Structure formats: C-alpha cells, structure tokens
C-alpha cells in the first residue's frame, strides 16, 4: 500500500528482547497506570542503569472499551546526566509508526492503517507528539473490529554507567475488540 512505502522502513526488524538476551518469562511485566480514560506507561524511573542490568521492563496496555487515550513517557538523553546518554526509542516516528509482530519479529506498520479511525493529535500539551520530546499520545476510536497488538520501545540498555547497565523499555498495546 502506497503512503506506507513512503513513511515506514520495510527493512527494519527487531525483537521485544532486543540484544538483552532476556526471555519474556523473565521480563519485569507490569500494567499501565490507568486513570479514567487515560492509560499511561511512564518509564521515567524504570530504565536507569542498575547493577543487574540489562533488564527488560514491559508495560502492558490492555484496552477493551472505547475512546481510551494512551500516553507513553520515555526519558530523554541528558535529562539526568550520564544515565540516558545512549537511550534510544523505536520507532523514531512513533506514534504514527508502530511495531507489530510479523512471523516472530517486530516490523514497522502505520498505526492509522492498523486501528482505523484512530486519532493522533500533532501536539502533546505544548510539545510535539514524538519521543524526541519525551512523550507520545494517541486516542483509540469508539469501535474496533479485530484484536490488535503493537509495540513501542524505549531502550536504555546500551547506556553504561560504572559497571551498571540500563534497562530496555517495552510497551504492548493489546486492543481487544469493542463497540461490537
């Protein structure tokens, strides 16, 4: 489909674990902070370099009701000296571009071609809706016909302080059908 050949990288491939070598049964899995209609995944304090690193921090966002708004916060490099120097986020074009599992690897997909009727506002408060500024947002539509799963990454595992290593953030947005 055209418009996809112009916005996504068809050659991109990654995995949930990345280069951490941690299997999913050893992830630190936890649920998003859900308040009213807003489900939030905040990695502000989850990814700092630790002795045991690299760890995988997976935030699970489970949606089965309409008009839910998802906010994801990924600390910027420089926010705290030394701790996020090598932090990276994927896709760079989030939330317009997301990762979906094709076969057994994560590849790029346009979120608007995945959850139709989605709303992505260009701004988050006064900021740009992009991990470049530290936070992304999108609002799911009143109706979803099919189960959908897509991922975001906020990886500080390549950052090293002392002998400590940062953790790898993962967001899984599991949108079960709703609205009939």
């Amino acid at each position, epitope marked *: 489909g055209v418009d996809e050949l112009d916005k996504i990288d068809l050659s991109y491939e990654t995995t949930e*674990s990345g280069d951490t070598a941690v*299997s999913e049964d050893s992830y630190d899995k936890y649920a998003s902070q859900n308040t009213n209609k807003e489900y939030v995944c905040d990695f502000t304090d989850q990814l700092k370099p630790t002795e045991s690193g690299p760890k995988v921090k997976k935030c699970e966002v489970k949606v089965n009701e309409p008009l839910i708004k998802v906010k994801i916060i990924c600390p910027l490099k420089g926010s705290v000296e030394k701790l996020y120097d090598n932090i990276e986020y994927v896709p760079k074009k989030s939330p317009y571009v997301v990762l979906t599992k094709e076969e057994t*690897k994560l590849k790029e997909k346009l979120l608007s071609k995945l959850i139709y009727g989605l709303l992505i506002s260009p701004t988050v408060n006064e900021k740009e809706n992009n991990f470049k500024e530290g936070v992304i947002e999108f609002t799911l539509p009143p109706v979803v016909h099919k189960a959908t799963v897509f991922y975001f990454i906020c990886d500080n595992s390549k950052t090293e302080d002392d002998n400590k290593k940062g953790n790898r953030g993962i967001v899984e947005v599991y949108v079960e059908p709703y609205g009939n």
Partner: single-chain antibody
Amino acid sequence: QVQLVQSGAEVKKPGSSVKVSCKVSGGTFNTYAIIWVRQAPGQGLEWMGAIIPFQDRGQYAQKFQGRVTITADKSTSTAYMELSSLRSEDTAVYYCAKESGRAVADRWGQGTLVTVSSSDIVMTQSPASLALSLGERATLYCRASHSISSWLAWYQQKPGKAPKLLIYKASTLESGVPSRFSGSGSGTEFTLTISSLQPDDFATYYCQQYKSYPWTFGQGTKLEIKR
C-alpha cells in the same frame, strides 16, 4: 520457567485425522508465536506452521497446506495442530514450540508420537557425521542457499529428547550453555565450534534459519565418540 505439555501418543489409520494438543504454562501465551515441527523416525526436523493466538489464524508450509489446521484456545493456553488425510509418511514425532521475544523457538514440548499404520532457504550442513575424542576441537558447518543475515540458531538433540537451543542470532549463547560452545558466521556461511569436547556434547546438532517462514533445518551432524 515456561513448560509446554503435549498430548499422548496416537496410532491412526491411513486417511483419518489426528489432533495434537500443546498446553503452555508459565509465560505469556496470547502474543507469542506457537510453532509446530515434526521429525520422522531417524530423520531431520521439518517446520509445519505457526500461530500467534490473538490473531486466530495460522500460517502453514506449502507441503501441508490444505491438509492441516493450527488453532489456539486462549482460555486454556492450549495450541492444537490437526493433520488430516494421514499417511504412513506422516509417521513422526510432532513438537510444539514457542518463541519468547527473541524470535527463536527457545521453548519446546516433549513431543507427541503419531504412528500411521493399517523459493525456500535450503540449509546444507557438513560434515554429516564427525567422530572425535574428548578434549578435541569440534567444528560444524552450515550453509544457507540465500542470505539469512544473522538469523541462525544451533540446536542440540539427544536421542529421545527434543531439540535444545544452544546458540541464536548466529553467536548468542542461550543461558546455561557452557562457554566452550561458540557460534560464528554471517550471511550464508556459519560455524558451530566446541573448543574442548566433553562427555555431554556427543549428540546430533542442527542449524536452523529463522529469517523467514518456512523455517528450514539442516540435516544435522551426528557427533559421536571415536572408538
């Protein structure tokens, strides 16, 4: 840790159907792929299909298309592989496996014996067999007919057991694998090396590409002790 439990053995007549179950306990079931691989008696491994349960639709190898169904019951965390129009040639041990976020199938069921009685990447492995003594350096070769980048895994299979993953991404050792194992290669030529052979090493080793379905295996290298 994750455990996959399959249904019991089954004897079937030619032309009938068989359904093998696979119960996953521990870990997450709905968003990770379940794989089905069979192995005829004394033969190599053969990928049949896969399924990510939340999608409710499976993917299949052309050999079995129109003849097999892979389902998943999310309420019981149980995957099924149903194979119709059975043959004597379908006599094999059928394994289910699961990927765990590292793309490779690193969790395997015990296998289920089914006896029937009344443009794909080609992996080439050498030597077919290797006879060495303890303390000696072992070197196994594996070639891919098309570039697979670094999406290559090395399995150790003892008799009667399921494949055990030793190396993924060409050279990443699975946890618990001793350092005397090492992997190397990129593109089309890969090697598995055992720096000093130990008693537990003598088995049959397979390489497998997981760049693209249908996943394909080499015919293995039987590494046995020298007289």
